[PDB]
């Protein structure tokens, strides 16, 4: 559109130059919600579920 | 220094061109998102 | 999670066009959140469903 077009060449010349966030991002999860799922288990049965 | 080198790689030829080579072929991820969706 | 998340994007985006095309400051982000513009605000307009 506003940009020069890629039908194929556009959504690889895109997905280039900024798959960092969409990697650290997806990953500041994961283990900042792994405290969750294990290293309890004591005082929240629900923290595991959740 | 050197790190960055380990995933800077990773993501050209083994990402973006093998990301390439995934609509080069389409075709069968018509199946495939269908045992993984009904397969849900 | 998702507050740590979205934050990242317009951060990262300085490490984009300074880094990449050279130019320092203030016009580093600026055109930046274009590309995440809607996808910043009417993101959870509808993700907001569930």
Do not use: C
Request: proline residues 3%; hydrophobic residues 50%.
């Amino acid at each position: 559109d506003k940009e020069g077009k890629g039908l194929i060449e556009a959504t690889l010349d895109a997905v280039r130059m900024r798959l960092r966030p969409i990697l650290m991002t997806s990953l500041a999860f994961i283990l900042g919600v792994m405290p969750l799922v294990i290293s309890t288990g004591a005082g929240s049965g629900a923290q595991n579920a959740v | 220094f050197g790190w960055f080198n380990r995933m800077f790689e990773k993501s050209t030829h083994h990402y973006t061109d093998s990301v390439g080579g995934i609509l080069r072929s389409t075709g069968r991820y018509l199946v495939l998102y269908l045992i993984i969706v009904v397969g849900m | 999670g998702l507050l740590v998340a979205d934050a990242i994007v317009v951060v990262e985006n300085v490490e984009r066009v300074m880094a990449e095309e050279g130019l320092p400051p203030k016009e580093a982000t600026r055109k930046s959140m274009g590309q995440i513009q809607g996808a910043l605000v009417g993101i959870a307009m509808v993700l907001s469903a569930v």
